[PDB]
Design an enzyme around this catalytic site. Structure first.
Site, mmCIF file in Angstrom:
data_model
loop_
_atom_site.group_PDB
_atom_site.id
_atom_site.type_symbol
_atom_site.label_atom_id
_atom_site.label_comp_id
_atom_site.label_asym_id
_atom_site.label_seq_id
_atom_site.Cartn_x
_atom_site.Cartn_y
_atom_site.Cartn_z
ATOM 1 C CD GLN A 1 18.731 -10.949 19.633
ATOM 2 O OE1 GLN A 1 19.098 -11.650 20.580
ATOM 3 N NE2 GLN A 1 18.948 -11.281 18.366
ATOM 4 C CG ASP B 1 17.208 -15.894 19.100
ATOM 5 O OD1 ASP B 1 17.547 -16.674 18.190
ATOM 6 O OD2 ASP B 1 18.008 -15.109 19.670
ATOM 7 C CD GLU C 1 18.142 -20.905 19.435
ATOM 8 O OE1 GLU C 1 17.911 -19.735 19.806
ATOM 9 O OE2 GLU C 1 19.284 -21.297 19.120
ATOM 10 C CE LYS D 1 28.369 -10.009 13.954
ATOM 11 N NZ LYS D 1 28.174 -11.459 14.327
ATOM 12 C CG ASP E 1 24.647 -8.369 14.499
ATOM 13 O OD1 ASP E 1 25.061 -8.998 15.502
ATOM 14 O OD2 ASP E 1 24.017 -8.914 13.570
HETATM 15 O O1 LIG Z 1 23.529 -20.264 19.139
HETATM 16 P P1 LIG Z 1 22.427 -19.266 19.294
HETATM 17 O O2 LIG Z 1 22.939 -18.033 20.091
HETATM 18 O O3 LIG Z 1 21.225 -19.923 20.051
HETATM 19 C C1 LIG Z 1 21.801 -18.789 17.648
HETATM 20 C C2 LIG Z 1 20.526 -17.935 17.654
HETATM 21 O O4 LIG Z 1 20.808 -16.667 18.307
HETATM 22 C C3 LIG Z 1 21.610 -15.765 17.537
HETATM 23 C C4 LIG Z 1 21.339 -14.428 18.202
HETATM 24 O O5 LIG Z 1 20.028 -13.985 18.091
HETATM 25 C C5 LIG Z 1 21.388 -15.760 16.026
HETATM 26 O O6 LIG Z 1 22.671 -15.357 15.513
HETATM 27 C C6 LIG Z 1 22.633 -14.645 14.288
HETATM 28 O O7 LIG Z 1 22.158 -13.278 14.488
HETATM 29 C C7 LIG Z 1 23.094 -12.498 15.303
HETATM 30 C C8 LIG Z 1 22.444 -11.133 15.552
HETATM 31 O O8 LIG Z 1 22.063 -10.497 14.361
HETATM 32 C C9 LIG Z 1 24.439 -12.459 14.619
HETATM 33 O O9 LIG Z 1 25.355 -11.631 15.290
HETATM 34 C C10 LIG Z 1 24.974 -13.833 14.438
HETATM 35 O O10 LIG Z 1 26.196 -13.787 13.735
HETATM 36 C C11 LIG Z 1 24.031 -14.691 13.709
HETATM 37 O O11 LIG Z 1 24.497 -16.043 13.771
HETATM 38 C C12 LIG Z 1 20.990 -17.087 15.481
HETATM 39 O O12 LIG Z 1 20.418 -16.925 14.201
HETATM 40 C C13 LIG Z 1 19.963 -17.682 16.287
HETATM 41 O O13 LIG Z 1 19.489 -18.927 15.751
#
Ligand SMILES: O=P(O)(O)C[C@H]1O[C@H](CO)[C@@H](O[C@H]2O[C@H](CO)[C@@H](O)[C@H](O)[C@H]2O)[C@H](O)[C@H]1O
Ligand SMILES: O=P(O)(O)C[C@H]1O[C@H](CO)[C@@H](O[C@H]2O[C@H](CO)[C@@H](O)[C@H](O)[C@H]2O)[C@H](O)[C@H]1O
Lengths: 649, 649
Positions: free
Chosen positions: B310, B380, B409, B250, B345
């Protein structure tokens, strides 16, 4: 091993004492089995109930549905069959076809890798086809598979072939279930119809005597039975039929000392003439009792005997089994009490010196009366004997004779009332007589028809020889009519005590719920022939109510009950439903003034649309109306206490 | 054998999944054990809680009391000691002395059967003395016996001797218990203090770099630790510290394609450089990580690592363990999603081909980091992996290492959130950020501090990199001040994500809860020094809140919390108590307008009389007030968000 399975299925209900006692039903009764079901991720789940009979045979495919959006609470209605001990489990599973269809309906019009999506669908339907037993159902799915795979056709056309009603119908019957996960089984005790449904009539055989012989016998009292059957009752409850003590015998109107030929209280059981396995000599012999039971059977009446585990001071047990009583330091036994009531004519039983002896003798006594056709016992004040004693006794009796019904006469605190039901009592007396306002009735019946119905079956006596409520005292005949309509239509089991239909309502004194000149302490001859002739009885209304109950399955169940809003405090409205049968009841609780009100029916709760208008017949009068979302009623005491309407087909 | 014992003891709570999972506590935490207890007849019962430690050793004498008249619900407070698996039972019993005293106090002044009554009392006190281990205590009871039996003294004097404070003290500790009946034991899992209580701080090490090397290392990032410790935090939560994928990386602001030196999302774990057991090369080495952990420990900071099960498309698992992923018919793996969010990603893990291999590798990875001083994991999105997978993993890890804390989470539906806590997660993220009105806060905290507290420990993050609530967007610094006070005082565990102190509140766009230029996709250097000097940080308020928590035991627990009424919708008031420590909080939830209100304290809930006035100190300012049943408050946003008062002793 993990506590949670592949697809979580949790907190299956109904449940009683975390599974240590059975939930209850009777033959033909429907109820909801529910569970919390969900999975990880965002794909769909499905669930179904597996109800197994006493031989372990599963019932039909019974799919559940989510009861409210976002709650993950799922439910399905099941129906109990033959009596015995059943079990139920909930199966939870991934629902991949629902998941795939959702995505495909979006992705295919979008042009998003449609060949791939359609091939995934084909592979799913191939899986679904393999499990399907029906040859025709299999060929139908496999045809959808081939249409999904036909790359010569438009994407929208390939997909549509997978979504036809023919295909839906197959999957509705034989869904593809992923990762099937089951709950541990829960027990269900299914009992006979009469445990839930029936009309009861209490009377004293000794009062039904003759001019030449005032003290009734079983042979004279048998002549009272035809009128009782004609009123539509199913059960007659008799106070104790045993010899009555003379020591400390109570006199008329609950006076301390009996004089002359005072007959005393039947609950003061025992003399040298015999105890709980004997018959009062003035009632006759065991042969005469057998005649009474035979006559009852001819009329469609079952006998319920009072079982009161307590002794007059003259009962043979007092000297034969001294350790069955608590003695004070001077050797005396304190008389029983139910504070502030005092029972100077009896001793209560003590259970912790010889619990085995008491249990053994108790079930021997019950089996004696069972052997003479008594299959129902009204158990006097069970809450003053140990809870585990009843659990043991009822388990013993029903172990050999599961048809026997025990009714708990426990007017006490809620925890004890509930526990007695949970440990085996088929029926319970209730707070009904002390619930008389719209709010009281609405709140209490919401409780009884709700979760409590999993373990408790209410018996609504509108009066008893101990309970003449102020509502009846102040309201006269119109109040008797109101309470009869309420009792008969709100519970599948109701009852009255003899004299109710004559609107006897004179209290011992103001502020008392005792009757003046109570039948408990004296012969109470009633001139039934004169009352009928002079029309000074509501026996015909009682008869009509029991007929309506016999003709409308809605009134023979408990759990389906809904209260509908009215604009008058004195006017209550409710509906009950069973299959295609719907009964709608509107009652004027004011026994002194005419009430007019608007009844606003919750139409969806009736399975109707808000604008619809449905024909109803008031079964008390034969009049027909058309009722909808808002209906005018005018109810006049002495004339129209209520409407008891059936929805016409 | 009967299900109900001699003296009914039913429905013991807390209970989790009908006893199949343990209720929870931490060392030094108090909670209520309750049960439904009653007996047959009219005499008294007593009850007590027996808490047994992991070696089966019982705790102190812990008598229960009826919690409300007529309910038969009894309770007592217990306190958890050393960590481990404990158990608790409730014992119920007849309380004959209480019953005898009740009657004796009536009958003796009435001259009713006095010699008999006093002798009955003597016999009870003798039996009581039989089970008293201490000889002086026995002699005290025997002196009462002898006085009870002294026929040469007046009845009132004989009775009084049995009712002295000295006699009462023996009987309070060593009551005569009739027919003692026990519940079956229920499990209690006692864990370390930090499972319930702690302040968390989240930051990205890569953002704390240098002019020459903008990408921070563990060495450079360790420079932030003293500032974090100085704000009074206990735990530092780091986003994933592993190599980051390049395929489908990303770009800034969650754009689909990274360009140039774009750093990508830390959650896109894995490259040829290594997987979840590896360090991002730009962060340094494992030796550098050890240094960071050591330096944190010296400052009283524990490290919590993100565990995100993941993979980026470049993770070694993709070719080493293809069966850990679901492949479509063309061999491709669909990217992960959390609809409507898309994670182009990364790939999600599939669990049903090799669940054993996944579990084995997962606990191997966790134990690697545990060997390097990480005893806390922020997990996560656990709700997109199977529930029983976590149940198994957590049981495995805690089996060898019970100190390890897992934080779920899972922002999802209530059933899944609760179930994850119940199957072993020590802490849970919550709905806190979406509860901002007085009604929302009151209802939600009533839930969290109630029954849910037996299995769930909330971690109130006031923001996260994914959650910038509109309340903060619209409210500016006064809103940040309010949410910090709320989070810090309503939960024993709270947290913030770096930048919260600076009141960063620019959203990606209107209607979004994402930050503009999110740190998830780019290095975000911050001028901490300048903010401190210009006072454009709320670090001092954060520091004060953590100091107040460290000095006031009431704020280090969850279950004791009561809301007090105010006459303004924007003003909320509540109190928390632990022993003699009472904290009263009043918050103005309006970040834009001054609010004045009268706060009407529920004085008996504070352990005070309604007429009483007590000194309080506002710990945010040091000002002292005198507060009673009705208190005036005027809260001006920007000047003061709240009063955080302690009751002065
Ligand atoms: O709302 P959630 O799905 O609980 C947020 C948490 O989980 C995602 C996925 O692991 C994380 O999202 C970030 O990382 C992903 C994967 O690299 C990105 O595609 C995404 O845009 C980005 O927001 C997030 O940080 C977790 O807290
Ligand atoms: O209110 P309850 O105690 O539940 C009424 C029932 O129990 C008593 C006791 O068996 C019965 O009371 C009648 O019989 C006793 C004993 O002979 C009399 O002392 C008493 O005055 C009389 O009311 C009652 O019939 C039961 O229904």
């Amino acid at each position: 091993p993990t506590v949670v399975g592949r697809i979580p299925v949790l907190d299956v209900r109904p449940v009683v004492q975390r599974g240590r006692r059975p939930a209850k039903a009777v033959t033909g009764e429907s109820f909801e089995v529910s569970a919390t079901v969900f999975r990880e991720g965002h794909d769909a789940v499905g669930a179904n109930v597996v109800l197994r009979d006493p031989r372990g045979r599963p019932g039909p495919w019974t799919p559940m549905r989510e009861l409210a959006p976002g709650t993950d609470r799922w439910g399905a209605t099941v129906t109990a069959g033959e009596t015995g001990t059943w079990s139920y489990t909930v199966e939870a599973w991934g629902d991949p076809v629902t998941t795939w269809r959702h995505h495909a309906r979006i992705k295919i019009p979008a042009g998003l890798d449609t060949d791939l999506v359609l091939e995934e669908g084909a592979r799913l339907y191939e899986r679904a086809a393999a499990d399907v037993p029906g040859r025709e159902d299999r060929r139908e799915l496999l045809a959808a598979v081939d249409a999904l795979r036909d790359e010569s056709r438009p994407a929208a056309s390939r997909l549509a072939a997978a979504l036809t009603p023919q295909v839906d119908a197959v999957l509705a019957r034989h869904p593809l279930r992923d990762l099937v996960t089951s709950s541990d089984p829960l027990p269900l005790l299914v009992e006979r119809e009469r445990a839930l449904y029936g009309a009861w009539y209490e009377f004293f055989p000794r009062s039904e005597g003759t001019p030449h012989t005032p003290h009734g016998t079983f042979r004279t009292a048998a002549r009272r039975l035809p009128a009782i059957a004609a009123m539509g009752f199913d059960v007659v409850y008799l106070p104790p039929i045993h010899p009555i003590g003379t020591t400390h015998r109570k006199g008329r109107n609950n006076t301390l000392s009996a004089t002359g030929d005072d007959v005393g209280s039947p609950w003061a059981i025992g003399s040298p003439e015999g105890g709980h396995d004997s018959i009062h000599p003035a009632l006759g012999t065991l042969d005469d009792f057998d005649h009474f039971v035979t006559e009852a059977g001819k009329l469609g009446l079952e006998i319920a005997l009072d079982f009161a585990l307590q002794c007059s001071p003259d009962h043979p047990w007092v000297h034969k089994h001294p350790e069955w009583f608590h003695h004070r330091p001077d050797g005396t036994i304190a008389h029983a009490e139910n504070p502030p009531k005092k029972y100077q004519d009896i001793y209560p039983i003590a259970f912790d010196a010889d619990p085995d002896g008491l249990a053994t003798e108790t079930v021997r006594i019950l089996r004696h009366w069972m052997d003479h056709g008594v299959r129902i016992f009204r158990v006097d004040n069970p809450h003053t004997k140990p809870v585990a004693f009843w659990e043991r006794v009822i388990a013993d009796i029903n172990g050999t004779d599961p048809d026997v019904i025990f009714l708990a006469e426990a007017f006490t605190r809620p925890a004890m009332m509930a526990t007695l039901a949970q440990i085996g009592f088929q029926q319970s007396y209730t707070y009904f007589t002390w619930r008389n306002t719209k709010q009281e009735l609405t709140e209490y019946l919401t409780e009884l028809s709700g979760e409590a119905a999993s373990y408790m079956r209410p018996n609504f006596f509108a009066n008893t020889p101990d309970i003449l409520h102020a509502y009846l005292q102040h309201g006269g005949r119109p109040a008797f009519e109101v309470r009869a309509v309420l009792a008969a239509t709100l519970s599948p089991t109701w009852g009255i005590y003899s004299g109710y239909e004559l609107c006897e309502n004179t209290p011992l004194r103001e502020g008392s719920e005792e009757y003046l000149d109570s039948e408990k302490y004296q012969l109470k001859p009633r001139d039934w022939t004169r009352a009928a002739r002079e029309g000074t009885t509501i026996a015909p209304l009682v008869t009509r109510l029991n007929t309506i109950r016999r003709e409308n399955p809605a009134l023979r169940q408990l759990r389906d009950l809904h209260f509908h809003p009215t604009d008058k405090e004195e006017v209550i409205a409710y509906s009950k439903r069973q299959g295609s049968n719907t009964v709608l009841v509107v009652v004027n609780l004011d026994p002194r003034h005419t009430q007019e009100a608007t009844v606003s029916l919750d139409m969806p709760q009736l399975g109707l649309d808000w604008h619809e208008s449905v024909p109803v017949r008031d079964e008390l009068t034969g009049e027909t109306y058309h009722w909808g979302r808002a209906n005018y009623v005018r109810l006049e005491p002495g004339r129209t206490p209520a409407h008891v309407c059936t929805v016409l087909r």
